[PDB]
Amino acid sequence: EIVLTQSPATLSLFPGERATLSCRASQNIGHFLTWYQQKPGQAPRLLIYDASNRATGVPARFSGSGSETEFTLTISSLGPEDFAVYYCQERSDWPRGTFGQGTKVEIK
Amino acid sequence: LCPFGEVFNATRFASVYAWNRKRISNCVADYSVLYNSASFSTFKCYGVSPTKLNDLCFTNVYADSFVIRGDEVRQIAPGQTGKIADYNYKLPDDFTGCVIAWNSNNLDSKVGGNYNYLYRLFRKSNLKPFERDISTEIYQAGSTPCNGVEGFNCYFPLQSYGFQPTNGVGYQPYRVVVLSFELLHAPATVCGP
Amino acid sequence: EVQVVESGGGLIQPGGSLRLSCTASELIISRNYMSWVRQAPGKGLEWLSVIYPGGSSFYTDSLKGRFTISRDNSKNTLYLQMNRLGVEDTAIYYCVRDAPSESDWGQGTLVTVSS
């Protein structure tokens, strides 16, 4: 079994800023990782797959970096609509696999 | 003697969706040199036991050869299920023969990922035992037409393994050879001494 | 965009059982990889179970033998037979379809278990 740790728990940047969301794996899962967005009350949405590829219709500002045991979703500039919860998931037995505990963005 | 040591000491190897079979005959094969192997991470056998094969004569061996991910070796057993067993290479629940595998990270992994090796991801239905399917039919996952090229709700049906260096032992490439035996009462050109 | 659409949300109790349903707008549920995932209030996502295109099906160790995924190819629909519940099995349950580069989630349906 694999478990995923996300850092931070809550991010608190303003709109316009570059953002990095971090994921660490309890095993070397190669490139087999996913990131999802989730707006409050919506179902999750795929952002990134295979640690680094961007899903269709996701804006070019999102990117995936890192491999093996350490992974990072990175956003070149926060839109006000990018304030959300973000989940990583290992997909090493695709489509099955464990999720992270998730990371929020909030300010005041 | 027999091709087995050349199937094992081979340079090139096949993708599991197009798994490559050798017909063996005209033969007198030393299986003890096989089970003496220091490289073989796995040497399962069903019906037979490794030390018995020099007593058993046969009509035919098929040696089936392919590359898969190192944890998918679990699925190369009689009656198993999971993507490789379901959509690439099925052993029957009454299989008699042996399953050999070894880590081939030094041959089959390449820097940034080796994309040359593939497996079939999409199939309308599970494979029959020893079935094969080499087709590139564009997979119609949508309710609408799809008509020869991928796009909105339809796909190329194969997936590349992308085998990386390092990247966890279960996720490294393993070369697999399966030895399968056949009988119809005639011409036993396989035995021990 | 494809819509996958859960149904069969509602209430039960300790002891009891329920069955969820899902349908899809422009995809064939029998041809796709399909799963169930749940999200309890104040808790993370739990992946539950999957059915592969050829009908092979798999489950998380938390729920092996409690819940059972199945489909009907004729109705173009997916089902989660969901037995022997506790209060803590209260969640939104999502139906989700996966492809190599795409993952299509339904809006989710509530299930609640109490007195």
Side-chain angles (χ1 to χ4, degrees), chain A residues 3-105:
Chain A
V3 299
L4 301 186
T5 298
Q6 284 182 227
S7 55
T10 297
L11 185 67
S12 298
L13 302 181
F14 297 107
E17 302 195 70
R18 176 179 169 159
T20 179
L21 291 91
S22 151
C23 162
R24 207 188 77 75
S26 73
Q27 296 203 344
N28 186 336
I29 64 176
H31 65 268
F32 296 113
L33 181 135
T34 333
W35 293 89
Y36 308 93
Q37 211 166 40
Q38 190 182 15
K39 311 299 180 67
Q42 291 194 355
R45 174 202 183 195
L46 179 68
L47 293 165
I48 297 301
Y49 66 97
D50 298 345
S52 60
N53 304 335
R54 188 190 304 103
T56 190
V58 177
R61 61 178 181 255
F62 291 94
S63 61
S65 59
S67 56
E68 297 190 78
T69 56
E70 264 284 348
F71 303 85
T72 37
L73 173 69
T74 288
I75 324 177
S76 69
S77 181
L78 284 170
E81 77 277 20
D82 298 336
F83 286 71
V85 178
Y86 292 82
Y87 286 97
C88 64
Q89 187 208 9
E90 73 82 14
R91 74 188 217 148
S92 72
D93 190 16
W94 178 96
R96 320 169 58 194
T98 62
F99 284 79
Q101 298 302 330
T103 296
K104 200 178 193 191
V105 196

Side-chain angles (χ1 to χ4, degrees), chain B residues 16-180:
Chain B
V16 72
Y17 85 94
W19 56 266
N20 188 62
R21 171 164 280 187
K22 182 66 179 178
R23 165 180 158 195
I24 298 96
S25 60
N26 312 36
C27 250
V28 58
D30 192 354
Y31 299 91
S32 73
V33 176
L34 307 182
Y35 71 73
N36 271 250
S37 177
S39 67
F40 295 170
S41 312
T42 299
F43 195 90
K44 301 309 301 181
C45 298
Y46 305 90
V48 306
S49 169
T51 64
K52 310 303 172 75
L53 279 302
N54 275 284
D55 292 42
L56 285 312
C57 295
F58 301 96
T59 327
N60 175 307
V61 184
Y62 305 110
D64 302 339
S65 61
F66 50 83
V67 188
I68 57 171
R69 194 153 59 84
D71 61 345
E72 298 182 318
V73 178
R74 187 195 70 69
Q75 303 175 30
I76 315 301
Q80 266 297 343
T81 187
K83 307 180 190 72
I84 309 308
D86 298 339
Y87 309 124
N88 315 154
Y89 185 84
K90 175 64 81 74
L91 291 190
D93 312 66
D94 64 356
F95 174 68
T96 182
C98 299
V99 178
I100 302 93
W102 66 103
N103 188 322
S104 64
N105 181 60
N106 61 344
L107 293 170
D108 295 320
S109 303
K110 296 292 180 178
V111 288
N114 184 6
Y115 302 97
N116 189 254
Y117 289 109
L118 307 104
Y119 67 100
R120 189 177 297 283
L121 185 70
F122 291 118
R123 265 286 296 205
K124 293 194 298 184
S125 56
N126 285 1
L127 255 71
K128 286 180 173 66
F130 298 113
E131 184 66 308
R132 190 169 162 198
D133 185 350
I134 319 96
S135 65
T136 57
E137 291 277 32
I138 214 85
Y139 186 80
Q140 194 183 8
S143 62
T144 50
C146 178
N147 303 26
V149 286
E150 56 189 343
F152 180 70
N153 301 296
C154 57
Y155 308 98
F156 191 71
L158 311 183
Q159 175 57 54
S160 181
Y161 277 120
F163 291 118
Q164 299 289 346
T166 65
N167 284 244
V169 178
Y171 308 119
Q172 286 167 14
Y174 274 59
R175 283 175 182 211
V176 180
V177 181
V178 181
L179 305 179
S180 176

